[PDB]
PDB file of all heavy atoms in Angstrom:
ATOM      1  N   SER E 175     -18.488 -12.559 -34.150  1.00 17.20           N
ATOM      2  CA  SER E 175     -19.129 -11.646 -35.118  1.00 17.20           C
ATOM      3  C   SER E 175     -18.566 -11.814 -36.551  1.00 17.20           C
ATOM      4  O   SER E 175     -19.292 -11.745 -37.562  1.00 17.20           O
ATOM      5  CB  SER E 175     -18.978 -10.193 -34.631  1.00 17.20           C
ATOM      6  OG  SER E 175     -20.230  -9.486 -34.621  1.00 17.20           O
ATOM      7  N   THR E 176     -17.253 -12.008 -36.629  1.00 14.88           N
ATOM      8  CA  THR E 176     -16.632 -12.170 -37.927  1.00 14.88           C
ATOM      9  C   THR E 176     -15.281 -12.931 -37.766  1.00 14.88           C
ATOM     10  O   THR E 176     -14.356 -12.937 -38.596  1.00 14.88           O
ATOM     11  CB  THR E 176     -16.842 -10.888 -38.829  1.00 14.88           C
ATOM     12  OG1 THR E 176     -17.239 -11.290 -40.164  1.00 14.88           O
ATOM     13  CG2 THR E 176     -15.645  -9.921 -38.788  1.00 14.88           C
ATOM     14  N   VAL E 177     -15.274 -13.630 -36.639  1.00 15.13           N
ATOM     15  CA  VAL E 177     -14.656 -14.925 -36.539  1.00 15.13           C
ATOM     16  C   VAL E 177     -15.462 -15.818 -37.515  1.00 15.13           C
ATOM     17  O   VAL E 177     -15.115 -17.000 -37.736  1.00 15.13           O
ATOM     18  CB  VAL E 177     -14.791 -15.496 -35.113  1.00 15.13           C
ATOM     19  CG1 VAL E 177     -15.778 -16.638 -35.089  1.00 15.13           C
ATOM     20  CG2 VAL E 177     -13.430 -15.974 -34.598  1.00 15.13           C
ATOM     21  N   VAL E 178     -16.544 -15.273 -38.085  1.00 14.56           N
ATOM     22  CA  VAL E 178     -17.278 -16.033 -39.117  1.00 14.56           C
ATOM     23  C   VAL E 178     -16.562 -15.968 -40.479  1.00 14.56           C
ATOM     24  O   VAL E 178     -16.356 -17.018 -41.119  1.00 14.56           O
ATOM     25  CB  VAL E 178     -18.811 -15.746 -39.211  1.00 14.56           C
ATOM     26  CG1 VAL E 178     -19.109 -14.516 -40.005  1.00 14.56           C
ATOM     27  CG2 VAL E 178     -19.466 -16.889 -39.889  1.00 14.56           C
ATOM     28  N   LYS E 179     -16.132 -14.765 -40.875  1.00 16.10           N
ATOM     29  CA  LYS E 179     -15.393 -14.575 -42.133  1.00 16.10           C
ATOM     30  C   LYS E 179     -14.025 -15.215 -42.076  1.00 16.10           C
ATOM     31  O   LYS E 179     -13.425 -15.528 -43.125  1.00 16.10           O
ATOM     32  CB  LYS E 179     -15.258 -13.083 -42.534  1.00 16.10           C
ATOM     33  CG  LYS E 179     -16.587 -12.286 -42.615  1.00 16.10           C
ATOM     34  CD  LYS E 179     -16.322 -10.825 -42.980  1.00 16.10           C
ATOM     35  CE  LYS E 179     -17.582 -10.104 -43.435  1.00 16.10           C
ATOM     36  NZ  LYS E 179     -17.191  -9.187 -44.555  1.00 16.10           N
ATOM     37  N   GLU E 180     -13.520 -15.407 -40.853  1.00 14.02           N
ATOM     38  CA  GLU E 180     -12.249 -16.097 -40.662  1.00 14.02           C
ATOM     39  C   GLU E 180     -12.475 -17.604 -40.785  1.00 14.02           C
ATOM     40  O   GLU E 180     -11.713 -18.300 -41.457  1.00 14.02           O
ATOM     41  CB  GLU E 180     -11.592 -15.715 -39.329  1.00 14.02           C
ATOM     42  CG  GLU E 180     -10.498 -16.645 -38.925  1.00 14.02           C
ATOM     43  CD  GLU E 180      -9.646 -16.141 -37.785  1.00 14.02           C
ATOM     44  OE1 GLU E 180     -10.198 -15.916 -36.681  1.00 14.02           O
ATOM     45  OE2 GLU E 180      -8.414 -15.996 -38.002  1.00 14.02           O
ATOM     46  N   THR E 181     -13.566 -18.078 -40.184  1.00 15.42           N
ATOM     47  CA  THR E 181     -14.003 -19.489 -40.256  1.00 15.42           C
ATOM     48  C   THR E 181     -14.312 -19.934 -41.683  1.00 15.42           C
ATOM     49  O   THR E 181     -14.092 -21.094 -42.035  1.00 15.42           O
ATOM     50  CB  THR E 181     -15.317 -19.741 -39.432  1.00 15.42           C
ATOM     51  OG1 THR E 181     -15.090 -19.462 -38.041  1.00 15.42           O
ATOM     52  CG2 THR E 181     -15.836 -21.185 -39.624  1.00 15.42           C
ATOM     53  N   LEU E 182     -14.856 -19.009 -42.471  1.00 16.42           N
ATOM     54  CA  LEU E 182     -15.195 -19.264 -43.870  1.00 16.42           C
ATOM     55  C   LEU E 182     -13.971 -19.324 -44.779  1.00 16.42           C
ATOM     56  O   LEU E 182     -14.013 -19.951 -45.835  1.00 16.42           O
ATOM     57  CB  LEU E 182     -16.159 -18.199 -44.402  1.00 16.42           C
ATOM     58  CG  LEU E 182     -17.636 -18.239 -44.003  1.00 16.42           C
ATOM     59  CD1 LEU E 182     -18.331 -16.976 -44.549  1.00 16.42           C
ATOM     60  CD2 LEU E 182     -18.289 -19.500 -44.557  1.00 16.42           C
ATOM     61  N   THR E 183     -12.894 -18.668 -44.355  1.00 15.58           N
ATOM     62  CA  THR E 183     -11.655 -18.579 -45.117  1.00 15.58           C
ATOM     63  C   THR E 183     -10.825 -19.805 -44.794  1.00 15.58           C
ATOM     64  O   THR E 183     -10.157 -20.397 -45.664  1.00 15.58           O
ATOM     65  CB  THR E 183     -10.894 -17.274 -44.733  1.00 15.58           C
ATOM     66  OG1 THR E 183     -11.598 -16.164 -45.322  1.00 15.58           O
ATOM     67  CG2 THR E 183      -9.376 -17.285 -45.180  1.00 15.58           C
ATOM     68  N   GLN E 184     -10.889 -20.210 -43.531  1.00 12.81           N
ATOM     69  CA  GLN E 184     -10.188 -21.415 -43.125  1.00 12.81           C
ATOM     70  C   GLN E 184     -10.811 -22.673 -43.773  1.00 12.81           C
ATOM     71  O   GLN E 184     -10.084 -23.541 -44.246  1.00 12.81           O
ATOM     72  CB  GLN E 184     -10.160 -21.519 -41.600  1.00 12.81           C
ATOM     73  CG  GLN E 184      -9.642 -20.254 -40.946  1.00 12.81           C
ATOM     74  CD  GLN E 184     -10.046 -20.120 -39.490  1.00 12.81           C
ATOM     75  OE1 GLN E 184     -11.109 -20.568 -39.075  1.00 12.81           O
ATOM     76  NE2 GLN E 184      -9.193 -19.494 -38.715  1.00 12.81           N
ATOM     77  N   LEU E 185     -12.142 -22.741 -43.793  1.00  9.90           N
ATOM     78  CA  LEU E 185     -12.888 -23.772 -44.504  1.00  9.90           C
ATOM     79  C   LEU E 185     -12.437 -23.926 -45.952  1.00  9.90           C
ATOM     80  O   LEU E 185     -12.010 -25.010 -46.347  1.00  9.90           O
ATOM     81  CB  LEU E 185     -14.386 -23.468 -44.481  1.00  9.90           C
ATOM     82  CG  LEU E 185     -15.449 -24.551 -44.797  1.00  9.90           C
ATOM     83  CD1 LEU E 185     -15.246 -25.814 -43.989  1.00  9.90           C
ATOM     84  CD2 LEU E 185     -16.896 -24.021 -44.592  1.00  9.90           C
ATOM     85  N   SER E 186     -12.546 -22.851 -46.739  1.00  7.20           N
ATOM     86  CA  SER E 186     -12.075 -22.838 -48.117  1.00  7.20           C
ATOM     87  C   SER E 186     -10.660 -23.413 -48.207  1.00  7.20           C
ATOM     88  O   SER E 186     -10.411 -24.372 -48.923  1.00  7.20           O
ATOM     89  CB  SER E 186     -12.148 -21.419 -48.712  1.00  7.20           C
ATOM     90  OG  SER E 186     -11.016 -21.116 -49.544  1.00  7.20           O
ATOM     91  N   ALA E 187      -9.746 -22.825 -47.440  1.00  3.03           N
ATOM     92  CA  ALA E 187      -8.326 -23.162 -47.475  1.00  3.03           C
ATOM     93  C   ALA E 187      -7.967 -24.591 -47.009  1.00  3.03           C
ATOM     94  O   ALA E 187      -6.837 -25.058 -47.198  1.00  3.03           O
ATOM     95  CB  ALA E 187      -7.496 -22.085 -46.698  1.00  3.03           C
ATOM     96  N   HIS E 188      -8.934 -25.298 -46.431  1.00  2.00           N
ATOM     97  CA  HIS E 188      -8.729 -26.674 -45.939  1.00  2.00           C
ATOM     98  C   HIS E 188      -9.695 -27.699 -46.606  1.00  2.00           C
ATOM     99  O   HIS E 188      -9.910 -28.783 -46.102  1.00  2.00           O
ATOM    100  CB  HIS E 188      -8.869 -26.695 -44.393  1.00  2.00           C
ATOM    101  CG  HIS E 188      -7.689 -26.143 -43.645  1.00  2.00           C
ATOM    102  ND1 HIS E 188      -7.820 -25.184 -42.656  1.00  2.00           N
ATOM    103  CD2 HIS E 188      -6.365 -26.429 -43.720  1.00  2.00           C
ATOM    104  CE1 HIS E 188      -6.627 -24.907 -42.161  1.00  2.00           C
ATOM    105  NE2 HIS E 188      -5.726 -25.642 -42.797  1.00  2.00           N
ATOM    106  N   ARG E 189     -10.249 -27.324 -47.752  1.00  2.00           N
ATOM    107  CA  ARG E 189     -11.201 -28.095 -48.511  1.00  2.00           C
ATOM    108  C   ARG E 189     -10.613 -29.384 -49.085  1.00  2.00           C
ATOM    109  O   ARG E 189     -11.257 -30.427 -49.000  1.00  2.00           O
ATOM    110  CB  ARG E 189     -11.713 -27.224 -49.658  1.00  2.00           C
ATOM    111  CG  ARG E 189     -13.083 -27.557 -50.129  1.00  2.00           C
ATOM    112  CD  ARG E 189     -13.981 -26.324 -50.029  1.00  2.00           C
ATOM    113  NE  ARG E 189     -15.396 -26.693 -49.907  1.00  2.00           N
ATOM    114  CZ  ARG E 189     -16.400 -25.908 -50.300  1.00  2.00           C
ATOM    115  NH1 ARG E 189     -16.126 -24.719 -50.839  1.00  2.00           N
ATOM    116  NH2 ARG E 189     -17.668 -26.323 -50.173  1.00  2.00           N
ATOM    117  N   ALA E 190      -9.414 -29.301 -49.683  1.00  2.78           N
ATOM    118  CA  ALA E 190      -8.685 -30.471 -50.203  1.00  2.78           C
ATOM    119  C   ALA E 190      -8.429 -31.496 -49.092  1.00  2.78           C
ATOM    120  O   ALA E 190      -8.628 -32.693 -49.286  1.00  2.78           O
ATOM    121  CB  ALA E 190      -7.370 -30.049 -50.864  1.00  2.78           C
ATOM    122  N   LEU E 191      -8.000 -31.021 -47.918  1.00  2.73           N
ATOM    123  CA  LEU E 191      -7.751 -31.903 -46.773  1.00  2.73           C
ATOM    124  C   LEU E 191      -9.006 -32.594 -46.267  1.00  2.73           C
ATOM    125  O   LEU E 191      -9.037 -33.822 -46.180  1.00  2.73           O
ATOM    126  CB  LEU E 191      -7.094 -31.135 -45.629  1.00  2.73           C
ATOM    127  CG  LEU E 191      -6.807 -31.869 -44.319  1.00  2.73           C
ATOM    128  CD1 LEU E 191      -5.958 -33.144 -44.557  1.00  2.73           C
ATOM    129  CD2 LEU E 191      -6.125 -30.892 -43.313  1.00  2.73           C
ATOM    130  N   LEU E 192     -10.045 -31.819 -45.949  1.00  2.00           N
ATOM    131  CA  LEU E 192     -11.306 -32.362 -45.481  1.00  2.00           C
ATOM    132  C   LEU E 192     -12.014 -33.249 -46.535  1.00  2.00           C
ATOM    133  O   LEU E 192     -12.564 -34.313 -46.224  1.00  2.00           O
ATOM    134  CB  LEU E 192     -12.224 -31.219 -45.060  1.00  2.00           C
ATOM    135  CG  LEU E 192     -12.094 -30.537 -43.665  1.00  2.00           C
ATOM    136  CD1 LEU E 192     -10.836 -29.765 -43.491  1.00  2.00           C
ATOM    137  CD2 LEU E 192     -13.258 -29.624 -43.420  1.00  2.00           C
ATOM    138  N   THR E 193     -11.994 -32.792 -47.783  1.00  2.00           N
ATOM    139  CA  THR E 193     -12.558 -33.475 -48.924  1.00  2.00           C
ATOM    140  C   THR E 193     -11.753 -34.748 -49.235  1.00  2.00           C
ATOM    141  O   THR E 193     -12.101 -35.480 -50.158  1.00  2.00           O
ATOM    142  CB  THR E 193     -12.495 -32.535 -50.190  1.00  2.00           C
ATOM    143  OG1 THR E 193     -13.767 -32.437 -50.837  1.00  2.00           O
ATOM    144  CG2 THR E 193     -11.426 -32.965 -51.230  1.00  2.00           C
ATOM    145  N   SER E 194     -10.684 -35.017 -48.482  1.00  2.50           N
ATOM    146  CA  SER E 194      -9.723 -36.053 -48.907  1.00  2.50           C
ATOM    147  C   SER E 194     -10.223 -37.450 -48.638  1.00  2.50           C
ATOM    148  O   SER E 194      -9.886 -38.388 -49.375  1.00  2.50           O
ATOM    149  CB  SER E 194      -8.330 -35.870 -48.291  1.00  2.50           C
ATOM    150  OG  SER E 194      -8.301 -36.249 -46.928  1.00  2.50           O
ATOM    151  N   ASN E 195     -11.017 -37.600 -47.575  1.00  3.93           N
ATOM    152  CA  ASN E 195     -11.785 -38.834 -47.417  1.00  3.93           C
ATOM    153  C   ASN E 195     -13.034 -38.836 -48.317  1.00  3.93           C
ATOM    154  O   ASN E 195     -13.908 -37.962 -48.197  1.00  3.93           O
ATOM    155  CB  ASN E 195     -12.152 -39.131 -45.951  1.00  3.93           C
ATOM    156  CG  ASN E 195     -12.083 -40.628 -45.625  1.00  3.93           C
ATOM    157  OD1 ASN E 195     -11.147 -41.325 -46.045  1.00  3.93           O
ATOM    158  ND2 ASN E 195     -13.069 -41.140 -44.885  1.00  3.93           N
ATOM    159  N   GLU E 196     -13.086 -39.804 -49.240  1.00  5.32           N
ATOM    160  CA  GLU E 196     -14.150 -39.889 -50.248  1.00  5.32           C
ATOM    161  C   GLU E 196     -15.107 -41.028 -49.921  1.00  5.32           C
ATOM    162  O   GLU E 196     -16.113 -41.232 -50.608  1.00  5.32           O
ATOM    163  CB  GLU E 196     -13.548 -40.005 -51.639  1.00  5.32           C
ATOM    164  CG  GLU E 196     -12.946 -38.697 -52.101  1.00  5.32           C
ATOM    165  CD  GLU E 196     -11.763 -38.889 -53.023  1.00  5.32           C
ATOM    166  OE1 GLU E 196     -11.765 -39.888 -53.769  1.00  5.32           O
ATOM    167  OE2 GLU E 196     -10.829 -38.048 -53.018  1.00  5.32           O
ATOM    168  N   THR E 197     -14.784 -41.721 -48.839  1.00  5.13           N
ATOM    169  CA  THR E 197     -15.570 -42.808 -48.253  1.00  5.13           C
ATOM    170  C   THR E 197     -16.615 -42.286 -47.247  1.00  5.13           C
ATOM    171  O   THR E 197     -17.689 -42.868 -47.041  1.00  5.13           O
ATOM    172  CB  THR E 197     -14.618 -43.734 -47.448  1.00  5.13           C
ATOM    173  OG1 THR E 197     -13.868 -42.937 -46.514  1.00  5.13           O
ATOM    174  CG2 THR E 197     -13.637 -44.492 -48.386  1.00  5.13           C
ATOM    175  N   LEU E 198     -16.274 -41.176 -46.605  1.00  9.59           N
ATOM    176  CA  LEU E 198     -17.101 -40.616 -45.557  1.00  9.59           C
ATOM    177  C   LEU E 198     -18.407 -40.043 -46.091  1.00  9.59           C
ATOM    178  O   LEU E 198     -18.399 -39.246 -47.026  1.00  9.59           O
ATOM    179  CB  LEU E 198     -16.329 -39.578 -44.741  1.00  9.59           C
ATOM    180  CG  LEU E 198     -16.927 -39.360 -43.348  1.00  9.59           C
ATOM    181  CD1 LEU E 198     -16.914 -40.628 -42.478  1.00  9.59           C
ATOM    182  CD2 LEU E 198     -16.266 -38.131 -42.623  1.00  9.59           C
ATOM    183  N   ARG E 199     -19.518 -40.492 -45.517  1.00 10.69           N
ATOM    184  CA  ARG E 199     -20.842 -39.940 -45.839  1.00 10.69           C
ATOM    185  C   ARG E 199     -21.378 -39.217 -44.619  1.00 10.69           C
ATOM    186  O   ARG E 199     -21.438 -39.820 -43.558  1.00 10.69           O
ATOM    187  CB  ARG E 199     -21.833 -41.031 -46.260  1.00 10.69           C
ATOM    188  CG  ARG E 199     -21.508 -41.730 -47.579  1.00 10.69           C
ATOM    189  CD  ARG E 199     -21.872 -40.897 -48.805  1.00 10.69           C
ATOM    190  NE  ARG E 199     -21.341 -41.491 -50.017  1.00 10.69           N
ATOM    191  CZ  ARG E 199     -20.047 -41.537 -50.333  1.00 10.69           C
ATOM    192  NH1 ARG E 199     -19.136 -40.986 -49.531  1.00 10.69           N
ATOM    193  NH2 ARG E 199     -19.659 -42.121 -51.452  1.00 10.69           N
ATOM    194  N   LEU E 200     -21.750 -37.947 -44.747  1.00  8.83           N
ATOM    195  CA  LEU E 200     -22.294 -37.204 -43.556  1.00  8.83           C
ATOM    196  C   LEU E 200     -23.727 -36.696 -43.778  1.00  8.83           C
ATOM    197  O   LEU E 200     -24.181 -36.589 -44.924  1.00  8.83           O
ATOM    198  CB  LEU E 200     -21.395 -36.055 -43.075  1.00  8.83           C
ATOM    199  CG  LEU E 200     -19.907 -36.341 -42.855  1.00  8.83           C
ATOM    200  CD1 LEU E 200     -19.122 -35.111 -43.307  1.00  8.83           C
ATOM    201  CD2 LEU E 200     -19.562 -36.721 -41.408  1.00  8.83           C
ATOM    202  N   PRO E 201     -24.444 -36.367 -42.677  1.00  8.45           N
ATOM    203  CA  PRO E 201     -25.811 -35.873 -42.876  1.00  8.45           C
ATOM    204  C   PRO E 201     -25.751 -34.550 -43.617  1.00  8.45           C
ATOM    205  O   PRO E 201     -24.899 -33.733 -43.324  1.00  8.45           O
ATOM    206  CB  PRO E 201     -26.351 -35.654 -41.442  1.00  8.45           C
ATOM    207  CG  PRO E 201     -25.128 -35.483 -40.585  1.00  8.45           C
ATOM    208  CD  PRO E 201     -24.077 -36.399 -41.248  1.00  8.45           C
ATOM    209  N   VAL E 202     -26.633 -34.389 -44.594  1.00  7.69           N
ATOM    210  CA  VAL E 202     -26.850 -33.124 -45.269  1.00  7.69           C
ATOM    211  C   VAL E 202     -28.358 -32.856 -45.360  1.00  7.69           C
ATOM    212  O   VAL E 202     -29.064 -33.504 -46.174  1.00  7.69           O
ATOM    213  CB  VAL E 202     -26.286 -33.120 -46.709  1.00  7.69           C
ATOM    214  CG1 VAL E 202     -26.593 -31.790 -47.427  1.00  7.69           C
ATOM    215  CG2 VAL E 202     -24.775 -33.422 -46.731  1.00  7.69           C
ATOM    216  N   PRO E 203     -28.850 -31.884 -44.526  1.00  8.23           N
ATOM    217  CA  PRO E 203     -30.246 -31.484 -44.629  1.00  8.23           C
ATOM    218  C   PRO E 203     -30.775 -31.388 -46.065  1.00  8.23           C
ATOM    219  O   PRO E 203     -30.051 -31.056 -47.014  1.00  8.23           O
ATOM    220  CB  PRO E 203     -30.270 -30.137 -43.947  1.00  8.23           C
ATOM    221  CG  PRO E 203     -29.233 -30.257 -42.880  1.00  8.23           C
ATOM    222  CD  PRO E 203     -28.160 -31.142 -43.444  1.00  8.23           C
ATOM    223  N   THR E 204     -32.058 -31.689 -46.213  1.00  9.16           N
ATOM    224  CA  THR E 204     -32.727 -31.585 -47.494  1.00  9.16           C
ATOM    225  C   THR E 204     -33.210 -30.137 -47.770  1.00  9.16           C
ATOM    226  O   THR E 204     -33.814 -29.836 -48.801  1.00  9.16           O
ATOM    227  CB  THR E 204     -33.848 -32.674 -47.606  1.00  9.16           C
ATOM    228  OG1 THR E 204     -33.343 -33.813 -48.335  1.00  9.16           O
ATOM    229  CG2 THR E 204     -35.136 -32.113 -48.259  1.00  9.16           C
ATOM    230  N   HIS E 205     -32.875 -29.223 -46.873  1.00 11.64           N
ATOM    231  CA  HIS E 205     -33.480 -27.911 -46.919  1.00 11.64           C
ATOM    232  C   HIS E 205     -32.561 -26.878 -46.282  1.00 11.64           C
ATOM    233  O   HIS E 205     -31.465 -27.200 -45.761  1.00 11.64           O
ATOM    234  CB  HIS E 205     -34.812 -27.962 -46.172  1.00 11.64           C
ATOM    235  CG  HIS E 205     -34.668 -28.251 -44.696  1.00 11.64           C
ATOM    236  ND1 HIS E 205     -35.017 -29.456 -44.133  1.00 11.64           N
ATOM    237  CD2 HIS E 205     -34.194 -27.490 -43.688  1.00 11.64           C
ATOM    238  CE1 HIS E 205     -34.779 -29.417 -42.833  1.00 11.64           C
ATOM    239  NE2 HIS E 205     -34.287 -28.230 -42.538  1.00 11.64           N
ATOM    240  N   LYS E 206     -32.997 -25.626 -46.265  1.00  9.95           N
ATOM    241  CA  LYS E 206     -32.080 -24.583 -45.823  1.00  9.95           C
ATOM    242  C   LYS E 206     -32.592 -23.858 -44.582  1.00  9.95           C
ATOM    243  O   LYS E 206     -32.387 -22.645 -44.399  1.00  9.95           O
ATOM    244  CB  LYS E 206     -31.734 -23.674 -47.012  1.00  9.95           C
ATOM    245  CG  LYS E 206     -31.137 -24.469 -48.171  1.00  9.95           C
ATOM    246  CD  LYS E 206     -31.534 -23.932 -49.510  1.00  9.95           C
ATOM    247  CE  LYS E 206     -30.452 -23.072 -50.105  1.00  9.95           C
ATOM    248  NZ  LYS E 206     -30.411 -23.365 -51.577  1.00  9.95           N
ATOM    249  N   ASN E 207     -33.265 -24.625 -43.728  1.00 10.31           N
ATOM    250  CA  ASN E 207     -33.572 -24.161 -42.390  1.00 10.31           C
ATOM    251  C   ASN E 207     -32.495 -24.772 -41.460  1.00 10.31           C
ATOM    252  O   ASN E 207     -32.646 -25.842 -40.830  1.00 10.31           O
ATOM    253  CB  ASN E 207     -35.016 -24.483 -41.998  1.00 10.31           C
ATOM    254  CG  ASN E 207     -35.588 -23.499 -40.947  1.00 10.31           C
ATOM    255  OD1 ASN E 207     -36.800 -23.479 -40.752  1.00 10.31           O
ATOM    256  ND2 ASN E 207     -34.726 -22.702 -40.268  1.00 10.31           N
ATOM    257  N   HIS E 208     -31.379 -24.063 -41.433  1.00 12.35           N
ATOM    258  CA  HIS E 208     -30.166 -24.519 -40.807  1.00 12.35           C
ATOM    259  C   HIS E 208     -30.322 -24.637 -39.313  1.00 12.35           C
ATOM    260  O   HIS E 208     -29.773 -25.580 -38.716  1.00 12.35           O
ATOM    261  CB  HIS E 208     -29.042 -23.549 -41.211  1.00 12.35           C
ATOM    262  CG  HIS E 208     -28.950 -23.348 -42.698  1.00 12.35           C
ATOM    263  ND1 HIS E 208     -28.935 -22.105 -43.291  1.00 12.35           N
ATOM    264  CD2 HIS E 208     -28.921 -24.245 -43.715  1.00 12.35           C
ATOM    265  CE1 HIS E 208     -28.879 -22.246 -44.609  1.00 12.35           C
ATOM    266  NE2 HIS E 208     -28.866 -23.534 -44.893  1.00 12.35           N
ATOM    267  N   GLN E 209     -31.082 -23.689 -38.745  1.00 11.04           N
ATOM    268  CA  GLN E 209     -31.331 -23.554 -37.322  1.00 11.04           C
ATOM    269  C   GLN E 209     -31.994 -24.780 -36.779  1.00 11.04           C
ATOM    270  O   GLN E 209     -31.762 -25.141 -35.617  1.00 11.04           O
ATOM    271  CB  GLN E 209     -32.286 -22.385 -37.088  1.00 11.04           C
ATOM    272  CG  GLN E 209     -31.602 -21.205 -36.478  1.00 11.04           C
ATOM    273  CD  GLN E 209     -30.112 -21.282 -36.692  1.00 11.04           C
ATOM    274  OE1 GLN E 209     -29.594 -20.798 -37.706  1.00 11.04           O
ATOM    275  NE2 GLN E 209     -29.404 -21.921 -35.747  1.00 11.04           N
ATOM    276  N   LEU E 210     -32.836 -25.392 -37.619  1.00 12.76           N
ATOM    277  CA  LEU E 210     -33.608 -26.578 -37.244  1.00 12.76           C
ATOM    278  C   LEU E 210     -32.745 -27.810 -37.128  1.00 12.76           C
ATOM    279  O   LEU E 210     -33.130 -28.806 -36.474  1.00 12.76           O
ATOM    280  CB  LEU E 210     -34.666 -26.911 -38.317  1.00 12.76           C
ATOM    281  CG  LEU E 210     -35.902 -27.674 -37.832  1.00 12.76           C
ATOM    282  CD1 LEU E 210     -36.766 -26.758 -37.052  1.00 12.76           C
ATOM    283  CD2 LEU E 210     -36.739 -28.208 -38.969  1.00 12.76           C
TER     284      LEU E 210
END
């Protein structure tokens, strides 16, 4: 339920680490129908 707000805080706080590979290309939807 808000293991979501915890997940969102951990994401922010680990952005430098994850962002650290600048070679990696991942899929990014062209739109905001996330469920799809």
Side-chain angles (χ1 to χ4, degrees):
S175 231
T176 225
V177 109
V178 82
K179 306 178 165 218
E180 165 168 61
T181 298
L182 284 174
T183 287
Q184 308 159 328
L185 197 51
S186 141
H188 284 129
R189 207 123 205 207
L191 177 55
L192 279 67
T193 231
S194 75
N195 218 42
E196 287 149 32
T197 53
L198 202 61
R199 293 282 170 290
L200 310 142
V202 177
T204 262
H205 65 252
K206 303 145 99 141
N207 207 166
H208 308 128
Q209 252 20 89
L210 206 73

